[PDB]
Design a protein around this ligand. Structure first.
Ligand code: HEM
Ligand code: IC6
Length: 453
């Protein structure tokens, strides 16, 4: 009836609550206190955060709700344009790029990307094989080396060579700093003052860097004529069956920037959290390592063998359950409608799906919801509708889901085949928030099982 709402700060409404280093975790705590739905107001805007499967299953009804761009996504659109993740469903370029790119992201496409994924995965294993006795691994940093290199190579046949360096690539410097400006711009009480003029000049400089670098990648490929098995070739050559049109070079650039963001720390976060949960749950690690040793019987894994890593796949889903690295998505009501028989919404009203809190709904998962139990995922039919949404919803779901899960299953399987792991610091989980999530400072030691490649 009277929708719950967290504490307000006069004319700033709830905005100061997101002036925090960990806003998603702060919102999760508000959900703990207020329940399945709460209103969140800022100057000139309002949304409603949903946390229960009961309400989110209705929000996922595409006849009633469509994808909205959150304030964060609207700011990211300043450098991802009408790429797939920041276009509205009704923009011509969304359905056009969706139709063109779907065959590039299917399981059949993964068979083609597999060899390049193995290339990078072997580089990761060789790095760890070559560490000296007393040394340790910085898990998120090395996982980000893996995922960035993989999307660079599979995306446009470019070698970031992240395992050869510590200084970030110039593109990544600007990309990370652009995303940082989005974070700072959100939790600005007075974001219009001229005190942020430098931040805005730097922001425009970083957009130009990303545009210039990707634009020349596209120009270089058209000039060379090479037809590699990557996303850029498919975008240069594909035609939308509906309109009959190809993507233009500007939109191709937006897609590439989008893929680079998604394949960076959003994807590496899944691997980082998965390894964290494995080392914190030794019986689960042992079961996953037993599968890896049984299935990965060749020096280089095949595509088919990765598909046979069923338990590793469940490990990844359970890591996505507890700490999904794209932690929210936004919706708007297409028409007047009533949520859950109790909350009337008007056309245009916005919703936020708080994914980590949805995934803690005890009415779905039981009381042991904080425990890491991959066996929860043995049967998708036993999971209620819309209870598990780490890849979003409907036609606006993650197009990269098969790509992320294939590269994650491949390298996690290889990690489990080749090394025993030690939580040598008894690492205390500390989740750093950018626009994604990562276990900050997570370190392990890896002792080789001395299995050759
Ligand atoms: C663990 C890794 C990933 C997670 C958790 C994830 C999560 C998500 C989520 C929740 C959405 C829906 C966003 C919304 O509704 O606003 C989404 C959309 C999208 N993702 Fe991912 N993603 C991952 C990896 C990737 C990768 C590797 C790529 C590409 C190389 C990618 C490309 C996209 C695109 C293009 C969309 C927009 C799809 C559309 O609306 O047509 N993602 N992702
Ligand atoms: O998590 C999400 C959905 C992710 C969509 C962004 C692009 N992408 C990343 C992985 N696949 C697609 N959106 C957050 C904020 C955010 C913005 C940009 C990047 C990450 C996170 C929110 O709306 O609050």
């Amino acid at each position: 009836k009277e929708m719950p709402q967290p504490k307000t700060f006069g004319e700033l409404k709830n905005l100061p609550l997101l002036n925090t280093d960990k806003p998603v975790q702060a919102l999760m705590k508000i959900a703990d206190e207020l329940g399945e739905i709460f209103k969140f107001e800022a100057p000139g805007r309002v949304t409603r955060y949903l946390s229960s499967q009961r309400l989110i299953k209705e929000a996922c009804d595409e006849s009633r709700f469509d994808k909205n761009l959150s304030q964060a996504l609207k700011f990211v659109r300043d450098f991802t344009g009408d790429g797939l993740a920041t276009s509205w469903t009704h923009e011509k370029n969304w359905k056009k790029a969706h139709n063109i790119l779907l065959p590039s992201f299917s399981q059949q496409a993964m068979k083609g990307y597999h060899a390049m994924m193995v290339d990078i995965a072997v580089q990761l294993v060789q790095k760890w094989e070559r560490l000296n006795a007393d040394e340790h691994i910085e898990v998120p940093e090395d996982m980000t080396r893996l995922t960035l290199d993989t999307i660079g190579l599979c995306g446009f046949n470019y070698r970031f060579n992240s395992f050869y360096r510590d200084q970030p690539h110039p593109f990544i410097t600007s990309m990370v700093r652009a995303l940082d400006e989005v974070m700072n711009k959100l939790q600005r009480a007075n974001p219009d003052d001229p005190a942020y003029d430098e931040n805005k000049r730097q922001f425009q400089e970083d957009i130009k860097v990303m545009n210039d670098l990707v634009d020349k990648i596209i120009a270089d490929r058209k000039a060379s004529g090479e037809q590699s098995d990557d996303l850029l070739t498919h975008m240069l050559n594909g035609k939308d069956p509906e309109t009959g049109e190809p993507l233009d070079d500007e939109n191709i650039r937006y897609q590439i920037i989008t893929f680079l963001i998604a394949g960076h720390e959003i994807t590496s976060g899944l691997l980082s959290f998965a390894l964290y949960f494995l080392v914190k749950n030794p019986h689960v690690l042992q079961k996953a390592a037993e599968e890896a040793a049984r299935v990965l019987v060749d020096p280089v894994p095949s595509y088919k063998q990765v598909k046979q890593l069923k338990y590793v796949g469940m490990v990844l889903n359970e890591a996505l359950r507890l700490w999904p690295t794209a932690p929210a998505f936004s919706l708007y009501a297409k028409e007047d409608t009533v949520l859950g028989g109790e909350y009337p919404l008007e056309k245009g009203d916005e919703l936020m799906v708080l994914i980590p809190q949805l995934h803690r709904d005890k009415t779905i998962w039981g009381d042991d919801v904080e425990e890491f139990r991959p066996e929860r995922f043995e049967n998708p039919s036993a999971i209620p509708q819309h209870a598990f949404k780490p890849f979003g919803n409907g036609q606006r779901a993650c197009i990269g889901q098969q790509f992320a899960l294939h590269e994650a299953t491949l390298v996690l399987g290889m990690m489990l085949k080749h090394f025993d792991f030690e939580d040598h610091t008894n690492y205390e989980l500390d989740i750093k928030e950018t626009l994604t999530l990562k276990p900050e400072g997570f370190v392990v030691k890896a002792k080789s099982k001395k299995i050759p490649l």
